[PDB]
Design a protein around this ligand. Structure first.
Ligand SMILES: Nc1ncnc2c1ncn2[C@@H]1O[C@H](COP(=O)(O)O)[C@@H](O)[C@H]1O
Ligand SMILES: Nc1ncnc2c1ncn2[C@@H]1O[C@H](COP(=O)(O)O)[C@@H](O)[C@H]1O
Ligand SMILES: [Mg+2]
Ligand SMILES: [Mg+2]
Ligand SMILES: [Mg+2]
Ligand SMILES: [Mg+2]
Ligand SMILES: [Mg+2]
Ligand SMILES: [Mg+2]
Lengths: 195, 195
């Protein structure tokens, strides 16, 4: 019972744009909101993907493979799930595997896909697909993983124990003034709650 | 090795601010990046809080209390963890318990706190504290919780079994068009991954 009335643009850019959104609340009163939008998504259900890489070895408990990388908007380094954009025509699952191999060097298999989930609904229309992927650490191809980053992408890879992911994440945030992604943290919190 | 060199304003607004950021990579080369910021930024620990509300009643499965709200930036409705901005001169924990009682009516006890985590690193600088709050559902004050929403806020409370969260979420996405918050989904995926 709430609908968007109009979207009056405010600014533009090479990657991001900002607009004013007019909408109707339940009662009928018109209200406004400042909405952020990207300029890269086209027909895809989500801007990009986020991979939950589960490293599996026969003599070890599963590791969650993450990536450390300086993020300009934060003016610092963030520990996130491998992530990327979905090219036109590319399936979320494909993009997830491609981006994982690019940012970590690991070839993996799909475990599951998810619906389009929002990154910050109270601010942007940004949605992504969280793809759970498995990686065989015992395989000879994953022996010495050589990352293959794109133009100007500099990524460090950090594998953390699924069993102790939350504690290990708290450790890295204090010593390097680092920042963990909210999704990575919510995932580690559930792992604690369940275990 | 990488740091901010300059942040050029591009646009402003009562709540949102667009910006162009110029920084240096590891090789000593300069690059840019478009970013977003909340003009309502002071000097606290984080922009706001996200509350993971676990409703606990004896002999019952635990329920994860979520909220459904129309989100202008999304042009539709989203299922999210109760959340709100921290007030000036307020602790995360206090913000968490307040924002919970205002958006769902429930009154709980702090379980654990998280360090500020980034909402969307490659687009914004917004951080939140994810606070796990337990709600004793066998107490009178939580028998019939009274939600006190702020002006123009329209929240619908939705409680789902923690033990079946991921599937009960999909049951809603299938029932009607809805977008689940990425943090909520990440959490739900891990509850299943832990075993
Ligand atoms: N807001 C932005 N400003 C400058 N470059 C961007 C922006 N958003 C995405 N990119 C580029 O897109 C790449 C995406 O990498 P990834 O999503 O981790 O596969 C980044 O490494 C940048 O080179
Ligand atoms: N980007 C925005 N555009 C218009 N109003 C906003 C925006 N961000 C926050 N607000 C206002 O701030 C309130 C914050 O609620 P909460 O997240 O519960 O603290 C919203 O209900 C809006 O009334
Ligand atoms: Mg990435
Ligand atoms: Mg990409
Ligand atoms: Mg990449
Ligand atoms: Mg809210
Ligand atoms: Mg509030
Ligand atoms: Mg509120």
């Amino acid at each position: 019972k709430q609908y968007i009335i109009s979207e009056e643009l405010i600014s533009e850019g090479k990657w991001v744009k900002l607009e004013k959104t007019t909408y109707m609340d339940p009662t009928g009163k018109t209200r406004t909101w400042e909405s952020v939008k990207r300029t890269t998504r086209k027909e895809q259900t989500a801007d990009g993907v986020a991979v939950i890489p589960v490293l599996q070895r026969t003599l070890h408990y599963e590791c969650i493979v993450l990536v450390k990388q300086f993020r300009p908007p934060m003016g610092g380094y963030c520990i996130e799930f491998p992530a990327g954009l979905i090219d036109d025509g590319e399936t979320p699952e494909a993009a997830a595997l491609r981006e994982l191999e690019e940012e970590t060097g690991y070839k993996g298999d799909i475990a599951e896909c998810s619906p389009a989930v929002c990154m910050d609904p109270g601010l942007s229309n940004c949605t992504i697909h969280i793809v759970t992927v498995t990686i065989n650490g015992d395989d000879a191809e994953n022996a010495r993983p050589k990352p293959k980053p794109g133009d100007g992408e500099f990524v460090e890879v950090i594998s953390l124990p699924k069993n102790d992911l939350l504690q290990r994440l708290d450790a890295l945030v204090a010593e390097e003034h680092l920042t963990v992604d909210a999704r990575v943290y919510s995932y580690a919190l559930a792992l604690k709650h369940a275990n």
